[PDB]
Design a protein around this ligand. Structure first.
Ligand SMILES: Cc1cc(-c2noc(C(F)(F)F)n2)ccc1OCCCc1cc(C(=O)N(C)C)no1
Lengths: 247, 39, 296, 247, 39, 247, 39, 39, 39
């Protein structure tokens, strides 16, 4: 015979191992493959699809009210309208999105994100907004004159109802980490703020309050590493009817 | 290492790097061009 | 200049030297360069063909050795009346390479290190003698080691539903088996681990000093899969790590004073030499005293 | 199947074994390599770097005082100034050096060493010294007329502030051993002594006491074998905060 | 013997004999010549 | 994976097995080989070297007296002088020789032996002897007329001080056995006897008693098989200072 | 079968049949001839 | 993988796809033609 | 499969089909012919 010796790790069951195993049903012929639309081969294809952010995650907002931000005409200039925390690991507006949900199965991430906002006011409504991304290091800007020093896009409402703010990958390290310390230098991405650029101006017959819907997605420079169990789902007991499977 | 006679006994296949994200990101009949207004 | 070195250099025979303007034995330490004086220039040498290999001092060989990094003992028993601090048939460990000095000192000989880590887990069991000082035999238990990365939830009890390990890598092994072994890849978010980090981990001023957040690994969670038996046992888990595929940069002065903490490089030194704060080397009576002088 | 039989040693865990092992994280992509200065591939590169000897390892010397040797003008000729034990395994002036620290991770060594001394007196100070290496066999020489029979360099202070004494590899055996028996024929290297050659002569305005700093390094004929745990570090208890890792 | 699909699973690599000690022994802009005074 | 099954003998420790085993010290470089005189590659080279027989193994002989045989002038003709048992396994004159010592590590042997005798009398001493080898089957011859029927050499003392008696390999079987039954047909070799051929004749000033030294060695047709533990060494307790190794 | 990287790990070498018994049986400067008297 | 010397020790043979159902479905001397009446 | 260095360690040899029954059935100097009387 062949002389052999067993290495450390022999006989172990590693859940991520990759080996062939004995076929339980010899000569079984699986059903022939048939073309089905919508095949996905890499999860990065899913995170590239836009999904709505829950910007209005406040106690006053119920159901889909949390998925839109209301803006009204103001009588003071350069007023802040809203900001968006950029932490995917923490429970924030980006968590329940395609990019957020898929990414929270991993520990490291890199690449640019894009935020798209659709103005859903009446045709007669007009206004200009400035959307700013502030790289980390300081406090979230509270005034337009400070926020406009960072990356920003000035958005003019019009026939094209939607604008895109690119959050470029600006990082010292190759990857960032989805870690619970939101203030860590390996995790913090910065802030996104939205200020009035001129004002929301509508005629008397239009609604005086208009809504924006914010979307987020990753660009094709996005990548993820270090698979982990998602903290978005858990169970403390057996589900109903699970016991019946053994009856 | 697969000495089994049935092909489905083989180890995992992690070499399919083909992608087509446009199936979900741009499923429109008229493709959009860069810079040009969509509407 | 870079070159391939497999053996120690040979020596070439040399003759008498009396040359004006040539002083190879004189040097200028102030420039920061080590003396370039050769033996052939200091004395008259013979020819020697040196066949001595240098492979055992390769960084890979120097560091690629399995070393203890974690040792945890916990009681395997019915923990219904156990304290909150007790390991109730499982434990979690925040992974670090700073708890055992032999490996720590060798690692801290370098500023930056890049390597993959081979992990070997060795388990031993002993019957509890407290009150029940009777021996019945050692059970062959099954254990689960789960790697919980940053941001993932760690199990809170032996039967926690977190152990289902949908995506976490888990290894199930038996005490009677040879020690479990797995390879962890270089998982730093940078190109190399920062053995030393002269910085703070957060954007505020209260973050920990001396630990690079880029090198955060995660938690190793180990439980006994078996439900408790009528009698209690003590289970000891030892974790060994062997770096491999190593790259190292910027060597450093070795640690001299004893380590105090795993969180910092704080130093106190021994009460007296050797390795005291004011005297690293042991004392001799005077600079003209030969400690081990050979007489006859 | 393949007939096999298990050899002695099967199932053992040898800490110095070299085998492949199961990857815990399939398809993980490590961070791309980046050029970093100061790469070291063989520890012999480190031992070739000069480091200071603790020649003045006496109770009267505190801190960095132990890293310099003071020399003064003498009124008798040919006087001994200091000697240096050459044992790396024992606790001596060479132990806390790059060469010493690295070598004490090994058991056998071979090759030439070099000692470099820098004179740190004033520009106006003058003097000549003789540095001698005595191969083993007898007592450390106590007089210049005996020490000068061995390998030596006569050092004239001047514009070049530093001189090098080569300790050539003179050994019956291919290697020596770092063994606690300092008088063993397999370990003893001999002695290094320093005598006044003429005198230290300084003017009235210069300091009447001048210091030397001694450095040691191995030449590129140096080699080491038989890795061992260094006796320079140890612990009798767990370090502080080590327990907290399990909390 | 490495039948694993991930390259980092391989055994140790002890065949890199390249050296450049001058990085630490002679990191000076002006290289020094043998015998000639440094200063 | 590879389907396998364990054979009988798996996991056993056979002291004569020949397999590779894990190197405990990776990358260790052994000391370079150096030419040393007197290399031996086959133990048969040692048994070919002459060594002295203990012919005079009698209670009256002490120390090296047992290594020589004294012969004196006789007043009767054709007298027997000595005989030599040819059994190597039994305790006899051939046991403490190079050939005997090496052979007693084995069980089977074959090939010719040679006995050489050196006459150590004075230059003035003269005499002739007959050395006979009797193949086995009967009693050891006690008279010259019977002994001379076998293989023999008549030795004349002279300038060449030594004669060689060849004991040719005369055996029914390919090998003989070193078995404790000295009378077995698989072990008995026969006898060697020495008779006066004429007489020892010396002048009055020479010693009237002269000594012979007998040597034995194997020829290059000698071979051995079936290694065994030598019965020439044993211990009933631990040697002195053996316990100290554990202290 | 030796998959170890260090050569000294290999199994025994029993193939060196070279001999030179004259080193011990005839270490004399003047070689002796068959039949001819030695002295 | 069969290192045994006797051929009957080998694993199963599942590669004989030859068929002849007419032995049981049409064991008549006169073969029947499609469409044409049998009788 | 024999990785042992000594040839006698090998498995059994069952391939010697040579026969000569006449050694026992017809060990006579004069061979007998078919049909012809033996005597
Ligand atoms: C010890 C350990 C165990 C596991 C594990 N145990 O079980 C499992 C499971 F679940 F798959 F089965 N995984 C995983 C990873 C581990 O450590 C990684 C070592 C990396 C490193 C960084 C530094 C550093 O910061 N430097 C050098 C400055 N040092 O080393």
């Amino acid at each position: 015979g062949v002389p052999t010796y067993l290495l450390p790790g022999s006989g172990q069951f590693l859940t991520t191992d990759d080996h062939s195993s004995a076929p339980a049903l010899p000569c079984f012929n699986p059903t022939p493959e048939m073309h089905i639309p919508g095949q996905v081969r890499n999860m990065l294809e899913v995170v590239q699809v836009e999904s709505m952010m829950e910007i209005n995650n406040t106690e006053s907002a119920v159901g889909m009210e949390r998925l839109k931000v209301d803006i009204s005409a103001l009588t003071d200039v350069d007023q802040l309208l809203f900001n968006i925390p950029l932490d995917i690991q923490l429970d924030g507006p980006l968590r329940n999105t395609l990019v957020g949900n898929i990414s929270r199965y991993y520990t490291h991430w890199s690449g640019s994100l894009e935020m798209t906002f659709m103005f859903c006011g009446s045709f007669m409504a007009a206004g200009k907004l400035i959307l700013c991304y502030t790289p980390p290091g300081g406090s979230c800007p509270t005034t337009r004159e400070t926020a406009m020093l960072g990356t920003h896009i000035v958005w003019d409402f019009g026939l094209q109802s939607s604008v895109t703010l690119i959050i470029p990958w600006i990082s010292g390290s190759h990857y960032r980490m989805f870690n619970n310390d939101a203030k860590s230098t390996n995790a913090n991405v910065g802030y996104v703020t939205c200020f009035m650029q001129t004002n929301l101006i509508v005629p008397s017959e239009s609604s005086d309050t208009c809504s924006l819907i914010g979307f987020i997605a990753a660009k094709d420079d996005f990548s993820l590493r270090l698979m982990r169990d998602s903290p978005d789902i858990g169970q403390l007991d057996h589900l109903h009817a699970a016991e019946a499977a053994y009856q | 290492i697969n000495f089994y006679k049935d092909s489905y006994a083989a180890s995992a296949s992690k070499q399919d790097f083909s992608q087509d994200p446009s199936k979900f990101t741009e499923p429109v009949v008229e493709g959009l061009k860069a810079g040009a207004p969509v509407l | 200049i870079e070159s391939i070195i497999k053996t120690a250099t040979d020596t070439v025979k040399s003759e008498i030297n009396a040359e004006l303007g040539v002083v190879p034995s004189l040097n200028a330490v102030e420039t920061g360069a080590t003396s370039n004086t050769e033996p052939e220039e200091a004395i008259q040498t013979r020819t020697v063909i040196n066949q001595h290999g240098v492979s055992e001092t390769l960084v890979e060989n120097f560091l690629s050795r399995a070393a203890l990094v974690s040792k945890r003992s916990f009681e395997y028993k019915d923990h219904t009346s156990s304290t909150a601090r007790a390991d109730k048939n499982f434990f979690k460990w925040t992974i670090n390479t700073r708890s055992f000095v032999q490996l720590r000192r060798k690692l801290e000989l370098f500023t930056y290190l890049r390597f993959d880590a081979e992990i070997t887990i060795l388990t031993t069991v002993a019957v509890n003698g407290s009150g029940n000082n009777t021996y019945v035999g050692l059970p062959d238990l099954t254990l689960q080691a789960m790697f919980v990365p940053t941001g993932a939830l760690t199990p809170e009890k032996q039967d926690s539903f977190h152990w289902q390990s949908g995506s976490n890598a888990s290894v199930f092994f038996k005490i009677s088996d040879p020690p479990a072994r797995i390879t962890i890849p270089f998982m730093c978010i940078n190109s190399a681990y920062s053995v030393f980090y002269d910085g703070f981990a957060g954007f505020e001023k209260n973050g920990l000093y001396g630990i690079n957040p880029a090198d955060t690994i995660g938690n190793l969670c180990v439980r006994i899969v078996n439900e408790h038996q009528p009698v209690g046992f003590t289970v000891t888990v030892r974790v060994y790590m062997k770096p491999k595929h190593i790259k190292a940069w910027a060597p450093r002065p070795p640690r001299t004073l004893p380590y105090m903490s795993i969180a910092n490089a704080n130093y106190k030194g021994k009460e007296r030499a050797p390795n005291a704060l004011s005297a690293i080397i042991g004392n001799r009576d005077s600079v003209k005293t030969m400690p081990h002088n050979i007489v006859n």
